[model samples]
Target: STGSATTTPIDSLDDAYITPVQIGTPAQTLNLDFDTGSSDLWVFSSETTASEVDGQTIYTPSKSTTAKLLSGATWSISYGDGSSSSGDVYTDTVSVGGLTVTGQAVESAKKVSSSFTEDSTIDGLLGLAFSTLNTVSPTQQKTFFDNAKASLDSPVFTADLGYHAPGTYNFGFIDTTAYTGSITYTAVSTKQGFWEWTSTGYAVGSGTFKSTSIDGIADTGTTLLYLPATVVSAYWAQVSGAKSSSSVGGYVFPCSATLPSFTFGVGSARIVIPGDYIDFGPISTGSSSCFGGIQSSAGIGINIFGDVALKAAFVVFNGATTPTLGFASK
Candidate 1:
């Protein structure tokens, strides 16, 4: 069976994509971040640390008749950007869109980290990555997608991320009406439990395309695109007043500076990111400098093709026995 859910960008910078999730017996609804990069279904709950209250909704497991604690199970997860959280575990009925998975591991926060505490908008994270990356110990748990894939009409899902607007995540099928032109597919290597793929090349604003393969992961949860230092420098070189500011911590340019589009090859197809998307609004309150969505992945361990690149095209995360990714113009 197939189902679809709407995802909304939380802030002007497209901080994270939030989608509704139903958990437990009576369906304790929680608005969560759907991340293809991370591998865990974790949430804030009544078990959270004391005196660390935020406006986020809490999942009181005791209130849900179907909630069952996983004795001796614990999990902790951190992201590429360095924020992390850890907590106890529970097995409950979980649903995304209309696809349901029984005995799903739902991580409960015992955290006071500002990362999850301050963000009132996102209650938890629903990982769409392979279950092998799951962090629970004593007894490992599978990801929601991994568990549901076997029964879907097809083992596939599509992400249509919007620009400062609501988007859609469809399970089991691709909506042909959503994109223009044919889909270009490239084989995927689920390395490190990610949907990792290699880009044949890249170009800057109709400029010369550098014919070099860039290995990266398609991460819907990450806010910006991070590439090799060389590739990032090439993009910033085209714009005047662009500099790596210590205060800004990354590349920032004059708000009025003209920017060039970024294009990357997937198979033989080119997906272009409009220059407008590069301007991530003003860097600080009443400042003239604006943040750039594309940055260098020097210490990030691996290149990341995050929401910035993903929003430019319609992407399909094909979960066939042999995995591959499909990219199409929107």
Candidate 2:
């Protein structure tokens, strides 16, 4: 049998989607952000300092009959956005949708940075990346998918992230009705603990495709597309009055500026990102300037096909032998 879950966008932030998950024997449900970039199933918990927790719900291990402490085990994680959390480890029955994984490693947060403490809604993160990236000390933990894979009919999952709308994340089986057109698949390299793949080329608007192979990761957690500096420069150059502003950070342009469509090549498939999507709202409410959804991957070292790109298609994260990425128009 297969299992699946529905993921919904939180308002129009389009930053990330949240899915309901159950933890412990009695089933304490928490809304978790399904992150593909990092691996660690850390959550706000009773151990979290009162000052460090805002409006987010906390998981109390003592309240669950199946919870067990993994004494001396601890986890610490820092995200690209600089948000971080550290905590002790607990083993509990964790379930997502209708699938259950017994004795899953659940990192219980003791301290969290303001980036996480300020975000009242996101209770924790459910990392969907490879288990190799798990941050537990002494022994790394397996992701929920890894623990559930053996029981699943197919070791795969699909991310259908839609712009300004609710999406679905399907596990074990692919729903053919979720996407349009054939899914174009490309081999993935998991050396970086990500769904990393090579893009054949890219083009700006109607310009001829530039045969520049780009190595990047498909990250649903990140809010924008991050590419090589040269690629980012080229795209911004095409937009009149666009410039990299240190004050606002990254490239900013007039909110009304006409932007061109951006396209990425996956094998022979050309995935086009609409122009309006590039304008990531305004820098501030009522501000005439807006931030570009595509930015330079300068310090990050790897390009990220974040929500700005992933929401443009239906994505399959194939964990079958020789992991591969499949994409199709939604």
Candidate 3:
């Protein structure tokens, strides 16, 4: 199973994104976007104007037989993807796949228009990735792990599932189902939002390009990997039959062939990038093609190990522990 519940595109509900998590009994579910950048769970409400929620799951907050909205709070979220949304806040009890979390904050997006709105089939997003990145009140609160940790099957939590990839959602209790081998644990540092880490260096196709350089962060919320332009261009050069075309944004190569392997060093831990993710295409029209596994973010700053890399490993955000991040092969 994926570490978290899997979201499915719903045909019956326009603009509705549904996750397989159970809400109480009768197999209830909620509409959400699993975001990493910010931590908060939100849903489109019936109170929201029809125009505001063109293609979103409209939650009839008042109709929930078991839960009630807090109504006075406010919330807004912005993403590294350059998209954002804002609205009033509300709290209610929510159940996900045999777990019930009470008084969870939900952001009601009064204004939402972007990839999050157009591509997302859900009215709201579920911020379960990291407690450090949580924007909700009581910053320490608001994360799925933080709110639902007590109810998890095991006190030991793990993000062992990969979305858009098999073997995603193997959470709770550190079961490395999809991982190839052993789990690698790294001592965590609480400096930046999410679980940021220092990269020892980088390698392209097994070639050491940088010598133990410290620069990079791991985030489950991000959908793709981002690297410096110098590193991205260098890595792309090693891919077999790799070619560049502006039409493809950066580098475009034949998907039929095996791309070179990529690895980033974090302290003593070496994280390898699988070839399957070497060709991340653009998420939508008119957007620059994202290299899937690697992209040029030269001036942008440190590397972000997003979904493409996250799928290959089982990650854990140890909010309860002193050293936060823990990893293993799932």
Candidate 4:
């Protein structure tokens, strides 16, 4: 819940919600929005109205075995994308994957628009990326990780997203066998709201093309990687017979030749972005040409390394420890 407190209750946590997780164990089932934009965990309730949009799941006190409402404070959430919601704070006993966490903070939407109210796929969002981008204030300090830490098997957590049907989202336990034993963690700079790190450099097309070096940050919430205009143009040049098309958007491309691989340097770690991800467009397009992963978001400041970059790696945000981010191989 967003540091705000208010009295209200919502009804039902259902399947319509586009939650962070599709399925977890009985002790660990949590419906959350795995957003890279903001790192916070919040649930919906009945008390919220126009200000808040209830996802597929809504929490109602009378129907629940254990639920309580927070008194005094209120919350209104506004996003950089121009999306917003508002509600009151409440508390209740929640169970996921057979694991029950008592006294979970929840928000009841009082106001919400079609953008949110129309899409009721998941009940709530679980910001598991990094704490630095946490919308929740330091004083309230509420998160599913913090609430479930004591019950989990390890200090570490894991996210296994299924691309296919039933998109099972599992939580808890870090299987070292699934990753490189060594973990590279980046410290969060107090000034930045999101967990950001200094990018040493980046290369496209197996280093065939190089451009001006740029510093960038890795964000899991974003869906695509963005680079400087020069960097994007330089990388796309390697694709054989590549042609940019306006039909699929300015950055889309098509080519018959094999695309080159791109690698990014973070500290001493070398992360690779596969060619397939770089390529875009429907199958009707002749080739999975190396499309421009980099796009121009003139109004948005800073370049972002999004899901295309995250799919290749395992990430863990250690909020319990001064908001640090740990990276492991997927």
Candidate with more favorable, higher lDDT: 2 or 3: 2
Off by over 4 Å in 4: 1-30, 43-55, 95-100, 118-120, 129-141, 150-154, 160-172, 180-182, 208-218, 239-250, 255-259, 279-293, 296-298, 320-323
> lDDT per prediction?
0.91, 0.90, 0.59, 0.52
Candidate 3 stretches greater than 4 Å from native: 1-18, 22-28, 129-133, 136-141, 150-156, 176-178, 208-210, 240-258, 266-269, 281-292
TM-score leader: 1
TM for every model, in the order presented, reads 0.98, 0.97, 0.79, 0.71
Error of 1 at 60 (Å): 1.0
Per model, how many backbone clashes are there? 0, 0, 28, 48
**Regions of candidate 2 where Cα sits further than 4 Å from its true position:** none
Candidates 3 and 4 compared: the better one by lDDT is 3
Q: Model 1: how large is the Cα RMSD against the reference?
A: 1.1
Weakest ten-residue segment in model 2 by summed lDDT: 8-17
